[PDB]
Symmetry: C4
Subunit: 299 residues, 4 copies
Amino acid sequence: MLRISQEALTFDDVLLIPGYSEVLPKDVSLKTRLTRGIELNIPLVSAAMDTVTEARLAIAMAQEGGIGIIHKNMGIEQQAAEVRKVKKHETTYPLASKDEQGRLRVGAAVGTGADTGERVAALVAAGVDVVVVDTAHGHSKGVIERVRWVKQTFPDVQVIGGNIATAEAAKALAEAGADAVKVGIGPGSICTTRIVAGVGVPQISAIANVAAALEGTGVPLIADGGIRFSGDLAKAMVAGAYCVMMGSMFAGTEEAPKGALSAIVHQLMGGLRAAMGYTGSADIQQMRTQPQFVRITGA
Amino acid sequence: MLRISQEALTFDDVLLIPGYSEVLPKDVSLKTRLTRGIELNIPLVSAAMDTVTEARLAIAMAQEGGIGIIHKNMGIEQQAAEVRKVKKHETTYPLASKDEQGRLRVGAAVGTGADTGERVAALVAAGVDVVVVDTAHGHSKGVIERVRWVKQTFPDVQVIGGNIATAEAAKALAEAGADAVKVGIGPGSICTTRIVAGVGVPQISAIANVAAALEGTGVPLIADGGIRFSGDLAKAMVAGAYCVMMGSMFAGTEEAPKGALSAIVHQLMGGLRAAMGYTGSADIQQMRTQPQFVRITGA
Amino acid sequence: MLRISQEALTFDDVLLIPGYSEVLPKDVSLKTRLTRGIELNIPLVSAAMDTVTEARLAIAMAQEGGIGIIHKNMGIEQQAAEVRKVKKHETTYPLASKDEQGRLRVGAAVGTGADTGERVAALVAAGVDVVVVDTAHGHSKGVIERVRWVKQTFPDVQVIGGNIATAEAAKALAEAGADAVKVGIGPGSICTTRIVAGVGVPQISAIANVAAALEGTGVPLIADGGIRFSGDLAKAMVAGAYCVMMGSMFAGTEEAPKGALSAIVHQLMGGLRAAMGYTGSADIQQMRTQPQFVRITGA
Amino acid sequence: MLRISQEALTFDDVLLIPGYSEVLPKDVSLKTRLTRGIELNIPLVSAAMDTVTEARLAIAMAQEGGIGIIHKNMGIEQQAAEVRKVKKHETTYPLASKDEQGRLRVGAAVGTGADTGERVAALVAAGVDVVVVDTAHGHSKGVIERVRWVKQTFPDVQVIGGNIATAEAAKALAEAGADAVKVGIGPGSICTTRIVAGVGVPQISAIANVAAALEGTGVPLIADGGIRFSGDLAKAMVAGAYCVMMGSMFAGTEEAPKGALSAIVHQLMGGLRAAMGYTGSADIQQMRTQPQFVRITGA
Ligand SMILES: [Cl-]
Ligand SMILES: [Cl-]
Ligand SMILES: [Cl-]
Ligand SMILES: [Cl-]
């Protein structure tokens, strides 16, 4: 009698099935798309969290082949200054994420507040590569219509909308002109969205439903939340993510506002390379479309 | 070979799927029905437990937009006096639950003992709004026939019967003239009904089976038991409850026989509003009929 | 590809669904059959364990309306003496289990060793009511052929065979002339049969498969193992057991070789009566055939 | 939308169903095949781990009726010397595993490194019985083509390939000429393959898929990983393993590079014999093909 749409799976419900392989971890390609217009050399994004991404950590992420999204828990002028610091950082890093001018890539988050138009303007004038319209509920008037507005007003900036967890949301963001979507609503066990609101979609099913909805559109999806180990990251990719956002795991690093960020990155990319080796996936498109899961009981 | 009627789900088996939303938590309507004849401004009832609801806590609940049910672990004259204190409390509280005379609403519990007729009479003469015929097993001769008797003898009082957990019980209460039913048998893990008697129905399935049985009748159902966080409350509503009863969570408050009851109420209603925001539900009827669950493994 | 016969359920996988009731716990009948020829006033048997049942505890069990099975971890002459002590105990206990001569009922266990014929003879000459051919694996030549032999050689004694856990075993025991079968192989989580041999059948499915196989034969089944609380006992009955054997739970009692056995009995029968009240079962035959389970996730 | 091939089961998801038995633990036969050409008197292999198998432990294993695989975390000349020590050990042990010359059997592991050809040559010249081409991912060019090469270059040595976990891998190894395959990828909960790479197949399903793929070929499979108790071992056999590899459980023994290895062996074989007794399996071929599982919830 309950209105149950499906059974939904998280990282711990599934394992990657090994497949034939002739490719070594060190030899696979980790190149992917952050957005329609933006490629990354590794599928790794740092979160728009005030304990995680400002200019220093965003610089390190771009140098590694990923990208940082500058958080929006600060003033407009501070946020544009963080963006400028990244875009002016003078560049040893053959993998760096860079724009057509050879400047490091950066993103910046915006919300739905009264200040959003002015914020987007200052960030775009500062040379931002991507504006991330980023709330706890991306399938909402505030997010979608803001994504529509950025796309129509600043047509040479990339726009990401999130956070979403359903096929329907992905399409509503695609129709608004989103160049990528970010996936993750209540993705961890015992996070405050589940406890407080009773709301959430287990992340492996969320990513897969959104990947299926977006197939053939050219719109990438970013998996944000619920990743604890590098094996989770591999699972997110096989479920259809184009890259993965990490937040609190980077929060203790030198670069954040325990050690170098580099170590953490290399360990995360190490496990992913291992998982590509096990599944026989030579590049990210193979990893996203070919390996299969087994479902497990957790016994 | 076992006589298993179904697999049944509790709060932890399910999450609310976010849906399109243009409504903010602060803007949704929490208006609902306690019974056929009685509306509440918030879907919240305090339990007929001797550590929870007497006149002081019942007053606070009515002022908040809900209602208190005075417990029956006391004498008949004490219980009527508790009711009178509520009905005479002189009323800053625009949400108050009130009768057609502007007096705060109150309920009172009765059992099946030899004293029930006299108890119901004293409570009705004291101006009670609702009589709650309330045992550990509402699908029983003692409860149903007592509900029939109150309805036939005092036709201007509202009557609730409980506790039940099945479609069949809901109908048997509806046929007896019940103006609402209360749902909850063995609703928590490791509660004494499960340990001692082996008896229970997981609460999300219980509420849904009873909501389905009652559809189109105009008879509301109250979810009583197994709610630990405000997210559980939201889930109870989506499963079809019209409001939710809380007991031990209020037991430490100033008003009960750690802080003000108000804080607890506002936090509980806060999470519900958040969950209505996430699901795009502007009012309680939307919340009860439109949002969907995903089933989770608990991995 | 695995040879999986079914998914099998234990006590914690299921709950009793409340049903219509007009019967109070105190008013239900607990009368049942231990065997074809032997009735008990309560469905409770004490185990043939050297820490549980000798003459003193067997006497108390019979006085309560159940029966004790004297354990076989002792000499033949000691075991016959334990039986004689019970049969001569002079009988305040209106519920007592008694034979056609007014003597308390007793059972005694035998194994498969070289001494079995002589043991059965001494026990029968001592006036035993039931011989329990009792090993860790009742579906075996040693048990079945011993049951056949007792039935053919001492046709005026009742014979129970165990322990079994399948339809096929029940039938093989019925064909050998067994007057009842005892059910329970690897019935607890983390018991030594599961850890050491990897062998076991969850007890709710075991009881149901054996009850289904025995339907219409007049052969009762005794549920032995995995019962921790009185609610488990109720579940065993609904799954089709005619009575239930308890071992280590009685091991600390005065009567065993923390308090009086009586307290434990009354608490166990209290929960069962409560469960009969909840399900509307006036007697044991109703309890075994009418109430239904819901399956639960354990979330 | 997820690419889930199946639900897959580990040891804790299943129990052996007892079946009719007239055979005692002590009387069953534990004779089996390690490879096409090699029989063992017990289905037990010690792992190619640097804390487990060198000449002393390999000698003890062969004397017990099993076999040791000498680990490859050492130099080529050291490994051939370990093999020679086993082949020259002068032989009280009626169960010993021996070649056609009366010398104890031994195996040795090789990897995929540049040194493999020279390693295989030295080991074969030292009189090795079986070469185990042994990596973390046997379904790979490095393993399969190395198995092909050993078979084509040294046609009088037995070759095992591993580790694998799928029907497809088993066949690819069979086609390369493998005389047996070794099964086990991410077989334990929380092992580093699952945490780091997100990769694994629950071991009962792995063994069954590989056994089904290999049926009628004459190629045995060895279950390697995830066995904690002797009951797990029995389950591995019923799922279709011909024998079972143990590693860290032997790591504390006298013979390894807490007590005698013998005790551990006898306890492991004790539980297996018990499980054969329960299921009525007189020999290993009966155990692999006849007993059935029940699936359990872990409640
Ligand atoms: Cl690898
Ligand atoms: Cl919200
Ligand atoms: Cl009751
Ligand atoms: Cl046995």
